[PDB]
Amino acid sequence: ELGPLKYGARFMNMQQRVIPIGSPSLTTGPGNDLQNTDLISSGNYIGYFGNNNNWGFNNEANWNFTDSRMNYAYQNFYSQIFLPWNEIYEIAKDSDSPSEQAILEIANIVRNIAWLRATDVFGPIAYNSAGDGSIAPKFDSQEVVYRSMLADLSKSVELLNTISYSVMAQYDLIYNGNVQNWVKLANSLMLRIVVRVHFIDETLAKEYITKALDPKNGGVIEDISSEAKIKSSDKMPLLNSMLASVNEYNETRMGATIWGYLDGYKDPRLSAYFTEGTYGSGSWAQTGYFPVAPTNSKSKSETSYSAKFASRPKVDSNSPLYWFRASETYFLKAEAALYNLIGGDPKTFYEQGINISFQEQGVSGVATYLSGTGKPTGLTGSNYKYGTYNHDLSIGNTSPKWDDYTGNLSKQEEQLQKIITQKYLALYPNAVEAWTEYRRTGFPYLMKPMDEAAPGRIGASIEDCRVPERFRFAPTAYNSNPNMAEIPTLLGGGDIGATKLWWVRSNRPKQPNQ
Numbered sequence: 098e099l100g101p102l103k104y105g106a107r108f109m110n111m112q113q114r115v116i117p118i119g120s121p122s123l124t125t126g127p128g129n130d131l132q133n134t135d136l137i138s139s140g141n142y143i144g145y146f147g148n149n150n151n152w153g154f155n156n157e158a159n160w161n162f163t164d165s166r167m168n169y170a171y172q173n174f175y176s177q178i179f180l181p182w183n184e185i186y187e188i189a190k191d192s193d194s195p196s197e198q199a200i201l202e203i204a205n206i207v208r209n210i211a212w213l214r215a216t217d218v219f220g221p222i223a224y225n226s227a228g229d230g231s232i233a234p235k236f237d238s239q240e241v242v243y244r245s246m247l248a249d250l251s252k253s254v255e256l257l258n259t260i261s262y263s264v265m266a267q268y269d270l271i272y273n274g275n276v277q278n279w280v281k282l283a284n285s286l287m288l289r290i291v292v293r294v295h296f297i298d299e300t301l302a303k304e305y306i307t308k309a310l311d312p313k314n315g316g317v318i319e320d321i322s323s324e325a326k327i328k329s330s331d332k333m334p335l336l337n338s339m340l341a342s343v344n345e346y347n348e349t350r351m352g353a354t355i356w357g358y359l360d361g362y363k364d365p366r367l368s369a370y371f372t373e374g375t376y377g378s379g380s381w382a383q384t385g386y387f388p389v390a391p392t393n394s395k396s397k398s399e400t401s402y403s404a405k406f407a408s409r410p411k412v413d414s415n416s417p418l419y420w421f422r423a424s425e426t427y428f429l430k431a432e433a434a435l436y437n438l439i440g441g442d443p444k445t446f447y448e449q450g451i452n453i454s455f456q457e458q459g460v461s462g463v464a465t466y467l468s469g470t471g472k473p474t475g476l477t478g479s480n481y482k483y484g485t486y487n488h489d490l491s492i493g494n495t496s497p498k499w500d501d502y503t504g505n506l507s508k509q510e511e512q513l514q515k516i517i518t519q520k521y522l523a524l525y526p527n528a529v530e531a532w533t534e535y536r537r538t539g540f541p542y543l544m545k546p547m548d549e550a551a552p553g554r555i556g557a558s559i560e561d562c563r564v565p566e567r568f569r570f571a572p573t574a575y576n577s578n579p580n581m582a583e584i585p586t587l588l589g590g591g592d593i594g595a596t597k598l599w600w601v602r603s604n605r606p607k608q609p610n611q
């Protein structure tokens with residue numbers, strides 16, 4: 098009835114758009130999309146990954162937000178998911194049927210997890226004008242977007258909580274129709290958004306963080322069984338979109354930044370996240386954990402001494418892509434507790450966050466890890482084999498032990514550092530959320546880019562800049578929408594990658610170079 102003839106397909110398409118993924122019959126299509134949003138862009142900047150190519154310095158990988166690549170990013174983050182969502186809206190906007198009303202609120206929840214990434218990447222977006230038929234939509238400021246999204250999520254939760262029967266289980270690749278689980282995802286996204294805005298607007302943060310956690314409202318994601326992930330299933334086969342860039346193009350490798358933490362912390366998640374690469378061959382062949390540096394400057398190489406044989410993220414056609422896991426919830430509460438948004442020892446949520454992350458990665462030895470005081474490992478000159486590059490990731494960097502401080506920051510500031518750092522490790526491979534959190538808090542410290550002309554390409558200086566502040570809108574886009582002329586005003590700066598977004602906290606910490 099309703100699923101096969103109206104929403105079913107549009108809904109599955111929406112789910113696949115949040116983080117680029119698709120059917121196997123779509124070959125490398127989605128991988129090219131995941132590459133633009135996560136692998137060679139965001140994942141590259143924060144150092145989750147390393148590119149075995151520089152593309153002639155012609156795309157987002159080396160911070161060259163060209164007109165074509167930015168139009169593509171806009172599609173991947175915003176417009177692609179809008180089309181099917183909008184159709185779902187035009188078909189159910191006017192229905193007394195509480196069932197179709199349940200379908201539209203879930204579609205909205207999905208569309209928001211997506212547009213959250215969009216706003217955190219571009220800043221102002223067309224949130225409120227969404228679906229008003231207008232030829233040229235109106236953009237809202239990142240602040241309005243945030244406020245509206247909060248109110249809308251809150252509105253989805255109210256209606257969805259009154260629904261007690263499985264909704265479109267046949268097309269729900271996320272929770273299989275379980276409406277209670279969608280309520281949790283929504284509140285969990287609320288908790289995310291609220292923590293995001295606390296430094297800027299402490300009161301807005303508190304208004305929603307309460308609704309998000311009030312038990313009467315469904316609660317948040319607290320068990321691995323409630324996590325939101327999408328993967329291949331009988332309901333809809335999928336080909337993990339990371340494979341194209343990892344195995345076919347041989348361009349995505351383990352990043353120098355995350356390797357640095359995993360290594361120096363003696364993190365058992367190292368083995369779970371990446372494979373062991375090779376260097377050379379035969380006798381003098383070394384087999385270890387070799388990462389590729391961020392914003393690589395060297396061209397693609399396929400020799401036995403190249404990055405083609407550096408460590409790769411472990412992944413196969415069945416691997417899933419995560420939207421929101423229990424571990425994040427705990428780290429969010431830790432930051433929340435740390436700023437009096439909720440009660441409880443920031444430390445208890447912190448450690449528990451790590452414990453859950455290990456359970457999700459199937460590893461163990463938490464107590465030993467939490468006792469560690471080792472510092473992240475750096476990439477000095479004669480250790481980086483894929484060109485010349487070095488960066489000391491340990492300088493002024495904290496360790497896993499909650500009570501172990503450096504003295505370089507106030508205790509409150511280091512505890513946040515610890516939280517965001519461990520959250521960074523638990524978030525993997527959610528490249529866009531980690532990158533957003535870096536730009537917001539300044540943590541965890543990252544390995545500087547290798548391509549020194551990178552900062553310059555977006556209007557910034559290498560001295561401080563370790564990553565772009567946002568993507569810019571393709572200039573030609575202004576020609577079709579006379580409203581975009583307002584973008585810079587809504588941004589508070591020019592439409593370039595150097596401009597900071599609304600939620601960047603003041604005095605964002607910076608690693609000491611020494």
Ligand SMILES: CC(=O)N[C@@H]1[C@@H](O)[C@H](O[C@@H]2O[C@H](CO)[C@H](O)[C@H](O)[C@H]2O)[C@@H](CO)O[C@H]1O
Nearest residue numbers: 125126129132133150152156345346347348
């Ligand atoms: C976008 C980017 O810079 N990366 C390219 C990949 O796109 C490319 O794969 C090709 O992509 C085109 C469409 O842009 C088409 O789908 C081709 O069939 C596909 O092979 C890849 C191939 O080696 O290299 C990347 O660096």
